[PDB]
A = this chain, B = another copy of it.
Amino acid sequence: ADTIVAVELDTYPYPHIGIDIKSVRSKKTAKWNMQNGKVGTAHIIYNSVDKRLSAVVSYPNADSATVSYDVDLDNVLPEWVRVGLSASTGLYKETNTILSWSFTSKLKSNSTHETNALHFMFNQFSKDQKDLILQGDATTGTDGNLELTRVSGSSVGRALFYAPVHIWESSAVVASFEATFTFLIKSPDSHPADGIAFFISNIDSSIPSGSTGRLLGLFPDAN
Residues of A within 8 A of B (CB): 39, 41, 43, 45, 47, 49-50, 52, 54-56, 58-62, 64, 66, 68, 79-80, 99-100, 108-124, 126, 128, 130-131, 144, 161-166, 169, 173-174, 176, 182, 203
Contacts and interface: CB of A to CB of B under 8 A. Distances in A.
**Copies in the assembly, this chain:** 4
Contact of A166 (B60, B131, B166): B131
Given A49-B45, A54-B50, A161-B163, A111 B124 contact: yes
Contacts of A116: 121-124
Contacts of A124: 109, 111, 114, 116
A218 B8 CA distance: 44
A98 to B, nearest CB: 12
Majority-rule SS of A interface residues: strand
A43 B173 contact: yes
Nearest to A40: B112
Given A49-B45, A49-B66, A126 B58 contact: no
A41 B43 CA distance: 27
B174 A43 contact: yes
A176 B54 CA distance: 13
Contacts of A54: 47, 49-50
A218 B77 CA distance: 38
Contacts of A122: 116
Nearest to A110: B62
A163 B165 CA distance: 11
Contacts of A109: 123-124
A25 to B, nearest CB: 23
Contacts of A128: 79-80
A130 B80 contact: yes
Contacts of A50: 45, 50, 52, 54, 68
B68 A49 contact: yes
A23 B162 CA distance: 30
Contact of A162 (B49, B60, B123, B163): B163
Nearest 6 A/B pairs, CB to CB = A163-B163, A62-B110, A119-B119, A117-B121, A130-B164, A162-B163
